[PDB]
């Protein structure tokens, strides 16, 4: 599996993030995170580097060349959907970075290193960066970097943007049904219904149903739906999920005629990941006194201040009679579930979330 490190990191990040946010909606792009963090890693040395490789799961299994090939595959023109991943480096115009770093970051990440005036015009630089990300995401991520995230001491901002727009292989019918948020709350949601031949299974270890909903082309959504807590009902699934347990099923399913009910939903979440990444073991990178980014600058005068991630998803019915029985499988997502969008060719997780609260 040529995207195993990324998936391992994704799951460990999700678990750590769930400590901070145990029940509310949660949405992120592990691919985007991993790409930016690999560019940061390329600059690290010493204990900073060793910790980053551990956290990003590079030691659990040519790193930069693997990112280059995976990105190429993710960016391949298809006709079936829109999918773009783009990296970018913004650097203080008066700073002198290591020539090998700028070269190799361009070579492996295609980051088109650009000078900006953080030293004197930080707020204009913030706006310029935000605007670039807005453009790459077709307006969907308009203000990645919040107020105060950049200042006169900022020297480099490393950025990834991802955008995906797909249509279901089979459209849904737009059908309100009660959604069970927790043992004390139900909220009405607009449901979408499909009856179709689909891959469906059950992961005993996680006590959850798994469904694959294909888009046109080689991208799918997988949904994981518990069938033991008075909260979201996800505690078991979230605590016990692992790469081995998930990958067996995404990459064991048999096709059947399934009646599917899922909510129409839209999420938009913003994270600041320093605390999470420190918790996962990436400590020295964020330590002003200890950080070693000599790969970026031989002066060894840099540290990682913060990591900002913003992700959104909008799920609806859009796709490219007489049946009356109900003997067979149902997948009725009227209570919280996990979901992920998988690039089937690379086996990379592009997006991963928890839908718990309409």
């Amino acid at each position: 599996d040529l995207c195993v490190a990324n998936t391992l990191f994704a799951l460990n990040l999700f678990k750590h993030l769930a400590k901070a946010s145990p029940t509310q909606n949660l949405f992120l792009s592990p691919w985007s995170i991993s790409s930016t963090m690999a560019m940061v890693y390329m600059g690290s040395r010493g204990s900073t580097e060793d910790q980053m490789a551990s956290v990003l799961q590079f030691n659990e299994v040519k790193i930069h060349s693997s990112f280059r090939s995976l990105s190429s595959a993710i960016n391949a023109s298809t006709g079936n959907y829109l999918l773009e991943s783009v990296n970018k480096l913004f650097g203080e115009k008066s700073a002198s970075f290591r020539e090998e770093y700028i070269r190799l970051c361009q070579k492996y990440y295609s980051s088109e290193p650009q000078a900006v005036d953080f030293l004197e015009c930080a707020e204009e630089a913030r706006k310029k960066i935000n605007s670039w990300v807005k453009t790459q995401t077709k307006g969907k991520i308009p203000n990645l970097l919040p107020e105060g995230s950049v200042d006169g001491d900022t020297r480099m901002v490393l950025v990834n943007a991802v955008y995906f727009k797909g249509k279901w292989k089979t459209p849904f019918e737009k059908k309100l049904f009660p959604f069970r948020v927790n043992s004390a709350q139900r909220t009405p949601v607009q449901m979408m219904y499909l009856r179709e031949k689909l891959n469906i299974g059950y992961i005993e270890d996680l006590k959850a149903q798994i469904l694959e909903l294909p888009y046109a082309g080689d991208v799918s959504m997988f949904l994981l739906l518990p069938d033991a807590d008075v909260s979201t009902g996800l505690e078991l699934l979230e605590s016990e999920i692992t790469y081995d347990k998930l990958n067996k099923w995404t990459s064991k399913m048999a096709e059947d005629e399934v009646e599917v009910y899922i909510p129409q939903f839209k999420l938009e979440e913003h994270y600041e990941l320093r605390s999470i990444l420190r918790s996962m073991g990436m400590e020295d990178a964020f330590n002003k006194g200890r950080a070693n980014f000599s790969g970026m600058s031989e002066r060894n005068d840099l540290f990682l201040s913060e990591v900002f991630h913003q992700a959104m998803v909008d799920v609806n019915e859009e796709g490219t009679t007489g049946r009356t029985g109900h003997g067979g499988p149902q997948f009725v997502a009227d209570h919280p579930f996990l979901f992920l969008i998988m690039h089937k060719i690379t086996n990379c997780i592009l997006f991963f979330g928890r839908f718990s609260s309409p």
Partner: peptide, 14 residues
């Protein structure tokens, strides 16, 4: 499905 994301790491001088 429409989905998107951004990621920004900020390097700061010391």
């Amino acid at each position: 499905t429409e989905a998107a994301a951004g990621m920004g790491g900020v390097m700061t001088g010391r």
